[PDB]
Amino acid sequence: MELVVKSVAAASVKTATLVIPVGENRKLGAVAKAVDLASEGAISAVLKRGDLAGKPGQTLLLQNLQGLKAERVLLVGSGKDEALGDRTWRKLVASVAGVLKGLNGADAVLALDDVAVNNRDAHYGKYRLLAETLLDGEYVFDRFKSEPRALKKVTLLADKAGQAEVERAVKHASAIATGMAFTRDLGNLPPNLCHPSFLAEQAKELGKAHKALKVEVLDEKKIKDLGMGAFYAVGQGSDQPPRLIVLNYQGGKKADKPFVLVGKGIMCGAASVFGTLRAVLELQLPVNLVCLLACAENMPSGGATRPGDIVTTMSGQTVEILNTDAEGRLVLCDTLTYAERFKPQAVIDIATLTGACIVALGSHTTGLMGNNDDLVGQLLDAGKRADDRAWQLPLFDEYQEQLDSPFADMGNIGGPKAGTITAGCFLSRFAKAYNWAHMDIAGTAWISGGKDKGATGRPVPLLTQYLLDRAGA
Amino acid sequence: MELVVKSVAAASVKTATLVIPVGENRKLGAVAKAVDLASEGAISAVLKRGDLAGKPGQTLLLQNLQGLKAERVLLVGSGKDEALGDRTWRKLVASVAGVLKGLNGADAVLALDDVAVNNRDAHYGKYRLLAETLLDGEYVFDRFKSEPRALKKVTLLADKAGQAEVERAVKHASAIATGMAFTRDLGNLPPNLCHPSFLAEQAKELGKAHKALKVEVLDEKKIKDLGMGAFYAVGQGSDQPPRLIVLNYQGGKKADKPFVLVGKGIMCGAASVFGTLRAVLELQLPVNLVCLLACAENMPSGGATRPGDIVTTMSGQTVEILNTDAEGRLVLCDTLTYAERFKPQAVIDIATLTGACIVALGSHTTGLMGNNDDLVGQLLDAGKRADDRAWQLPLFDEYQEQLDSPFADMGNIGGPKAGTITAGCFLSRFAKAYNWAHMDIAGTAWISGGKDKGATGRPVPLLTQYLLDRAGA
Amino acid sequence: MELVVKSVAAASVKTATLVIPVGENRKLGAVAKAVDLASEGAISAVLKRGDLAGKPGQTLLLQNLQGLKAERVLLVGSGKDEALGDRTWRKLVASVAGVLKGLNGADAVLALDDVAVNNRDAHYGKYRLLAETLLDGEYVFDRFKSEPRALKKVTLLADKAGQAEVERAVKHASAIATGMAFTRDLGNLPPNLCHPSFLAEQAKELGKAHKALKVEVLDEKKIKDLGMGAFYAVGQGSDQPPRLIVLNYQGGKKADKPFVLVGKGIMCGAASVFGTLRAVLELQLPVNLVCLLACAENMPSGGATRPGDIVTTMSGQTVEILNTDAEGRLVLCDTLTYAERFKPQAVIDIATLTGACIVALGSHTTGLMGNNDDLVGQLLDAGKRADDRAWQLPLFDEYQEQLDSPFADMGNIGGPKAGTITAGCFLSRFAKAYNWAHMDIAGTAWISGGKDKGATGRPVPLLTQYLLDRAGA
To answer: Disulfide pairs (chains A, B, C)?
Structure first.
């Protein structure tokens, strides 16, 4: 779908469908009133019949009206006068998109300037959320199913003053949504096909397509020979061997320290790193970004790791693997040591790490921990502006003893209490060299059931926003 | 909702909303084509734009069209050029009703004569299903919540020849839907209000309202004094005492044997008997119908029955109560002995009796067992014609040993194998005096939830259809 | 054991043991009275002492009596005058066989003509059940244990009119019992020894021994190369590879369409196919019978299929393998596609498929589903005449949605409700090309515990009866 911005009057634009908002009590803002007047009162005449109460997202679709150049006018409820919160605004946009998807119209014009969104400026933040909802909602994953939609273009109308800010919002939302689609395809792919070697092929192909990107893949023997005893212990059980994939984007000055993203690829952590990199390549951000994808397949077999095994991590710390299903933190901890070589200014790991995070923060909010208050605050602020929120949990020292082992430097589990925090605590012991934060996306990376089951693409908006903020874009 | 039938031309009829069907490829049957012609090709013109693909239940709502008397036209998809099955036809009607309930029109006209429904005649069977779906779909249970709908009347258009048969379908569906509303309200009432004494007061109120109905309520001491040891044992643990409620409707000839319906009232079995009785009263069927509601509340306490207790049933047979959660069969078996006094031609018990029936037949199909093939077959056929299906399970003699007790004449459980059948087998030992069937509605009596959730109307259409069949209506 | 039929008088026959029935109240039928008279009243004299009450199966064994040529006379209770049901009649026959097994007599004569069996003619159906019980009860499986019985021959006496029908019963029961023994040996063999390659060797050996039989075995690579993605996914986890074994018996006319039996061989479904084929070869039935044994071993390992895998079946439909323990339907669905090539007049799959069938129909009755009402009725009638009963469950379309997947054409599980039906529903989607039925023998193929633990040989009597019915034998 092409997204464009114009500043011409809504009533003047030739289009298959013009979309205008209508509030409760059939209240029309200035944009809607101008279109009603161009229609000689035809829109207000239908509204007086009472079929559209105006609650957010309710719709009434009209056919060809004399006086307008639109073939159809879609009226969409904007609710009470109050400014809308982010969820209501995105639900209104998705309700519009739903109707448009079902029509045989080749384009549409959205004339929603009058809709206020709480705490967001009328041109950039409001349209960041509309454009991301509109483009992410085009996603289809029908590869394994045994009809192309008519809608190819949407025009957003804004006043001439606000045009460049709406265009900037569209540019950034398009990059985010393209990244998200990549993340959602990799997550949705079934595990027979999406294994560590497939991810390594996807990264080598992405490297060949981008000048400023260099890709290295470390295979099982290299992981073992680097001393990555925890990462090797997770992968050994499977016939599909592990891969540590490095993707190094040099978009900054040569002596700028890079941002490092570490993704758990057992694999929506790794997928969100690929998606954020794809967004950064689209935007050509002027940062140095090193992506480390820690990929393995955790399977039972006659050569698998067994509860009670003790391994030497790359750092030299030993770990008692009490539970082989606490495996993400094992491939992560060796990859955090590996990240030291880049001399980074921030290292952020993203992982579907704990069922306990779903108990603490559910499906709405990603769990965030770290060793640096400024980096944690930057990620929280990014999530608020991107509408991809996180929330900090504490790594107080009192939780660390839960990982003590009588035999090794630490165990990999902390017991039933504070499970998201003790996993963060485990990882912190490998992150002391640099400013680090950990994002547990076990609750926000996918939808379990319904027809909406499948990957969400989170946290590509928060990560891409954080890197826009560091680039000063 | 008032529901009436007319045989006037659709384009001629004054109404807030006219509903007509459109097939795939914008194909119009005779009725729709006539309204298109009256509209001066307005309906075809909009169809050519392609917003309505015409899959079953899809919709497109038009406003005032020149040449018609209807204020609005709703187009609804009827699919390809082949007859619909019951489920698809009922879903189409519910789609139409959903749109109408959201509009501010005080009436609507359905002109859906051209839609064929597989194995249902165009006047009676087709409209039994439409009218019940429409009328049951109006149900609201908002009494415990802290806006009435505009739609007050629907007119169905049929040709002059079929009018009386559509009217007879509306008469029968209206009685069924009014019975189902009563059933659903009693099921959805919470248990601190809907206890056995409440149901006794419901029955006594119904007895006052109706001439041919006599109601007697037997209290705990009566049940104990009649020797109903198994029914007494279920109720004794609660502070709410049990009631056996008798409602006797003498609509037949004096010497005609009655049909007896026995409902488990622990309580949707008993509620479906109340709702079938309310439909029979509305229809004034010329049958003798005796309803026996076996009502108790099964609670833990210091005076409750305890696993291993042995009781003497009214029949004199002893039962070892191995599980106190197999309680519905205990109140039922004594009520089946009580039913012998009526010298019935059929005794049907209805009960939410086994989780095993949900494992066997799920949410769609009621489990059915009996001692008389003709009666079982009459109930199956009634279910097919009412679109409230059941399915027989065998009461082979080989299952009876699973009830053996070393101490008593039987135990009340049969173990983990064949649990719906062994409950039927237990009840069959009390039904040998008469032609008997048992309906296990544990899967079909409510939605659980889902996200929209509550009692079904489910016993009522089959049972009402069986009594229309016996009354030769 | 040799089974023969004669029509001479019971008292005249030289034998180690003559067996006669005695009813309650010491009532003697005409055959028993004639033997009493030949013994000069010695049998009635012992009976007046009261040790034998005559309940079915009770026994009294006499020694050498003057006047008879039998060395011993066994009196067996036949109960009250009523005709016996099938179970009681078979239990009486097994009680006789029990005594005979313990004696050092080389032969025995059964003179049980007077015993009536409910709904069975005195010569064919009555003796079908006696002869099958007598010969199946000879079964021994002592291969893995670290004494040969004296009884080598039994003569059944009947009147000369009925001799040829009793002989026909014996011929058909012997074929069934021989088939059953083969089925019971393959089921009883332990899984270390009985793996898919062993079954393939058993089928190639059976092919070499029968002129009208051709055997082909498809190995793992052939299964994969045919596109059988579901069958290959089940077997891949194990070190023992899968086999699809084809056994084609051409006993009919060349242009007669064959009957196809599909057996799950994970393996009593496959075993019952081998046993039914062995019975058909013994009888030289004039039908074309193609047997397809879908054999694999379902094991965990580092290369096993994992919940969430998506595979392409031979048909091109894709399946999401939600649960790797729903594996029978996976090897079956690709074998049902394979069966299309034979252009069959009936395809029947037999499988130990669901624990839910044991909840629905227990150990007594096999679950039956299909897409053709005539074939389902034929199998039900066969099971009633063979005393190997089945019972139909419905494949209503409403159960099909339980298999929907958001990613693939279907999932392989339907949830906790209606599990036997949803497995049938899954299979039906691969059976549309032909008349098909599915037999779930999870409850009837073996006895779990006791000393009687082990395979039953069911449903070889129902399947062999169905093929006798189609041959017109």
So the answer is: none
Distance between CA atoms of A114 and A10, rounded to whole angstroms?
A: 12
Q: Is A300 in Cβ contact with C301 (below 8 Å)?
A: yes
Distance CA C98, CA C178 (A): 20
B309 contact partners, CB below 8 Å, separation of at least 6 = B233, B320, B321
Residue of C87, C89, C357, C361 to mutate for B, most B C-beta atoms under 10 A: C361
Tokens coding C167: 């002989």
SS3 state of residue C151: coil
Which residues in chain A touch residue B102, judged by CB atoms under 8 angstroms apart? 51
| Distance between first and last Cα of chain C | 24
Tell me the nearest-neighbour CA distance from A307 into chain C, angstroms.
Answer: 17
Interface list for chain C against chain A, based on CB atoms closer than 8 Å: 300-306, 308-311, 316-318, 320, 406-409
Q: What Å distances lie between residue C374 and A62, B60, C291, C435, CA to CA?
A: 54, 44, 21, 9
Contact B236, B303 (CB under 8 A): yes
Residues of A in contact with B61 (CB under 8 A): 51, 60-61
Task: Please name the residues in contact with C129: beta carbons below 8 A apart, sequence gap of 6 or more.
Answer: C86, C89, C90, C93, C117, C120, C387
B228 burial type by CB count under 10 A (0-12 exposed, 13-18 middle, 19+ buried): buried
Technique of determination: X-ray
Chain A adjacent subunits, 3+ CB pairs under 8 A: B, C
Q: Which domains does chain A have, with CATH numbers?
A: 1-189 (3.40.220.10), 190-473 (3.40.630.10)
> Residue B59's closest chain A neighbor by CA?
A102
Cβ–Cβ below 8 Å for B361 and C418: yes
C283 vs C278: CA distance, rounded Å: 9
CA gap B163, A260 in Å, rounded: 76
Q: What value does the CA radius of gyration of chain A take, rounded to a whole number of Å?
A: 25
Q: In Å, what is the CA distance from B307 to each residue of B326, B327, C286?
A: 10, 11, 59
Q: Is B327 annotated as a binding residue?
A: yes
The owner of tokens 């693409």 is A457
Which has the closest alpha carbon to A193: C430, C229, C410, C323? C229
Nearest-by-CA chain B residue for C395 = B361
Indicate the pairing of strand B73-77 with strand B2-6. unpaired
* Residue of C87, C360, C402 with shortest CB distance to B360: C360
Of C359, C393, C399, which is closest to B364 when you measure between CB atoms? Answer: C399
Sheet with strand C318-321: strands edge to edge: C309-312, C318-321, C410-411
- The neighbour count for residue A81, using CB atoms within 10 Å, is 11
| Cβ–Cβ gap B49/A72 under 8 Å | yes
Site from B44, B63, B451 to mutate, A interface, most A CB atoms within 10 angstroms: B63
Q: Which of A51, A61, A63 sits opposite B104 (nearest CB)?
A: A51
Alpha carbon distance, N-terminus to C-terminus of chain A:
24
B440 and B359 Cβ atoms separated by less than 8 Å: no
Interface A-B: count of C-beta contacts within 8 A: 32
**Tokens standing for residue B114:** 């051209």
Q: For residue A235, what is the nearest residue in chain C, using CA coordinates?
A: C302
